[PDB]
Scaffold this active site. Structure first.
Site, mmCIF file in Angstrom:
data_model
loop_
_atom_site.group_PDB
_atom_site.id
_atom_site.type_symbol
_atom_site.label_atom_id
_atom_site.label_comp_id
_atom_site.label_asym_id
_atom_site.label_seq_id
_atom_site.Cartn_x
_atom_site.Cartn_y
_atom_site.Cartn_z
ATOM 1 N N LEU A 183 -100.047 -26.006 -45.781
ATOM 2 C CA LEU A 183 -101.283 -25.894 -45.030
ATOM 3 C C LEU A 183 -101.724 -24.442 -45.005
ATOM 4 O O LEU A 183 -100.889 -23.547 -44.909
ATOM 5 C CB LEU A 183 -101.084 -26.426 -43.606
ATOM 6 N N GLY A 221 -96.337 -28.312 -46.267
ATOM 7 C CA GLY A 221 -97.422 -29.085 -46.843
ATOM 8 C C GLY A 221 -97.296 -29.353 -48.338
ATOM 9 O O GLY A 221 -97.818 -30.329 -48.880
ATOM 10 N N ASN A 237 -90.248 -27.533 -43.356
ATOM 11 C CA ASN A 237 -89.742 -26.411 -42.562
ATOM 12 C C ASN A 237 -90.629 -26.036 -41.390
ATOM 13 O O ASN A 237 -90.555 -24.897 -40.869
ATOM 14 C CB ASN A 237 -89.488 -25.196 -43.473
ATOM 15 N N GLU A 238 -91.442 -26.936 -40.893
ATOM 16 C CA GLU A 238 -92.351 -26.762 -39.755
ATOM 17 C C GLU A 238 -91.662 -26.147 -38.555
ATOM 18 O O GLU A 238 -92.233 -25.218 -37.912
ATOM 19 C CB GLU A 238 -92.974 -28.108 -39.360
#
Ligand SMILES: CCCCCCCC(=O)SCCNC(=O)CCNC(=O)[C@H](O)C(C)(C)COP(=O)(O)OP(=O)(O)OC[C@H]1O[C@@H](n2cnc3c(N)ncnc32)[C@H](O)[C@@H]1OP(=O)(O)O
Lengths: 249, 250, 258
Positions: free
Chosen positions: B64, B109, B133-134
């Site tokens: 993102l 993303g 890995n957010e």
């Protein structure tokens, strides 16, 4: 208190909860009760974000459900006790803490109520330290929520086999099926658990907690919404004269 | 410009190359270029499979575009998220065969894009790590992305991978099952062409019906509450701690 | 009989040997013989486990009988599919321990039988491939069979297996998890006996209740939509494009041997 030794390291944000209900850390009501109280205090103490669970004495992590609690007792006592069994599962499985099991003994079904609800499982490499949901060996079956927990750990196929055969996996097999995450020499179990919890505690805490909750809420909900029915199911079963009789062996 | 679509000679398969430097960030513009390009290929009866890859090796996609998520208005956040959802829905349910030739790092993303494909081949470079890995940024994967991951590597592995926000290097990625093959980096493209040929040989309608049977329930979980998911995104990303982390990062 | 039952009441095990040559195709006849043979063994209190295997090695089962599905009346297709559903339901929910000794090729309908067992052992012959290859015929697995496969090998692998219509040779079959053991051909029967000895030793009712707990949700999805699923099969298989795909595949089959 008595049956749960908490060794806190507030500076590290870690505590070790050592089971101390000899001879085999059987899940008596006092023990179940003391475990949940102890976990709750560590939860509400903002100093603490990770807990390692282990036996004070190696050999047996927990022998599981306690026969004294279930033999010739009151209807009232049975309800209080299966309620306490459920409570331990629920509070462990949904805890906001990082929970790591340092499995330094044999871990049959009720020991798996604890191990499987943690975030990470490390097993000492001792051929006597077998782990699994062995209910069928005794002529009984795993509660649905414990089956669900196992399925969430090892997948449907392996859970079907493990539950029907009531398998207690020795360490290499336990690793292969995925019921534990690491197998290490017995003398390295506590250091491995320290390394593991360092890693898990380093994650930004709220995001970790939200992620854990998203992963586990459907499974926990299945018990929360049927909890009374599940107690009645237990009670009806074990209140039987014939099951009572079979407890007699 | 952001998406190059290169038809193979003989048609059948096209290669879609990402070209939004420096890291193939999923800007709003790139998201909509991907959706239109995919739709064109779907509608063209000459094409039934697509290989997705970066034009330049190194980064498959950084995920993102955080600039769409940090300075901005609530309506901007919402329109951006609707586009992110659209890309996932359209990829995951594509009637095309989709194969990822993962020729770079593939965090959050990027990993989304990869996880929506039918097959994932990863170039063997120790820098080309893949995962969701957010949590490293204090963010979480949306439920539908978590479901996509669980659908790829199973519940236990997803529980760990998502909480720890892990990026798997190639050997670990193969072991956990987040990719299907690891090959030398100079073979990733040719391997993808070989692998998609297996898929192209399946009776097309039967393949598509089967794919839909496998994926419709997961997709439908988002379709039924898509606006709810946008509002949850906007409320979550707008929190001050989240905004501070993104700006610091940026 | 097209189903040969070899009993060992003292050990509590029977071996059910498929004998519907040439390839143990699941004709309507054979389907109903398998259902009845399984019910008789269920009802016989001397038996608690059954090994399923082919009497003749080489093909475990070629699966559904295409001649039942090609150029027949709509009622024929419906009656056939009700029998197919019946076999899956009875096998999947059997109170017996069921072990497949897979001593031959095992494509889609065969795999139906194998996937409903409690344990699968595959003989290590490179031609003994196992999988749900419906898409190679231009058809698809029914939802309930897809669910059985997902319950065996997980979502991701089921996605790939079903879309590609893979017939896994033995090493790949073991790696993906569609079988539990791969053993030399001459050990498949002995391995099945060893396996089932262990399964039969479990307290029977507890085992049965556990098996039901694992499987009832999957079976209930068919039970509650069963006549709709017949309707859907008939409508689907009757499409001219599907008839064409099936008769072309039948024709290909016949050509590859004669
Ligand atoms: C919506 C839901 C949709 C439907 C779900 C359907 C699930 C299915 O079972 S689909 C069918 C899957 N089965 C197959 O792909 C197996 C087809 N067969 C084969 O590949 C080979 O026959 C196999 C594996 C048995 C190898 O044995 P082999 O001896 O080497 O070959 P083969 O020459 O074919 O065998 C000889 C005879 O058996 C027949 N035969 C083989 N398979 C089948 C079958 N599935 N149907 C009917 N006849 C068959 C052959 O046609 C031939 O005789 P004939 O032409 O006179 O009928």
């Amino acid at each position: 208190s008595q049956r749960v030794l908490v060794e806190p390291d507030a500076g590290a944000g870690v505590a070790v909860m050592k089971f101390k209900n000899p001879p085999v850390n059987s899940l008596s009501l006092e023990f179940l009760t003391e475990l949940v109280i102890s976990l709750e205090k560590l939860e509400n103490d903002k100093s603490f974000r990770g807990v390692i669970l282990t036996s004070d004495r190696p050999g047996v992590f927990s022998a599981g459900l306690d026969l004294t609690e279930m033999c010739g007792r009151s209807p009232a006592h049975y309800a209080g006790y299966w309620k306490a069994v459920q409570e331990l599962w629920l509070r462990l499985y949904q805890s906001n803490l990082v929970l790591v099991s340092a499995i330094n003994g044999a871990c049959p079904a009720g020991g798996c109520l604890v191990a499987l609800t943690c975030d990470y499982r490390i097993l000492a490499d001792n051929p006597r330290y077998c782990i699994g949901l062995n209910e069928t060996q005794l002529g009984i079956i795993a509660p649905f929520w414990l089956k669900d927990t196992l399925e969430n750990t090892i997948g449907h196929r392996a859970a079907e086999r493990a539950l029907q055969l009531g398998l207690l996996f020795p360490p290499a097999e336990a690793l292969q099926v995925g019921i534990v995450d690491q197998v290490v020499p017995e003398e390295q179990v506590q250091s491995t658990a320290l390394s593991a919890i360092a890693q898990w505690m380093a994650i930004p805490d709220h995001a970790r907690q939200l992620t854990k909750a998203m992963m586990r809420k459907a499974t926990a909900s299945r018990l929360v919404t049927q909890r009374d029915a599940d107690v009645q199911n237990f009670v009806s079963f074990i209140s039987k004269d014939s099951i009572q009789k079979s407890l007699q062996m």
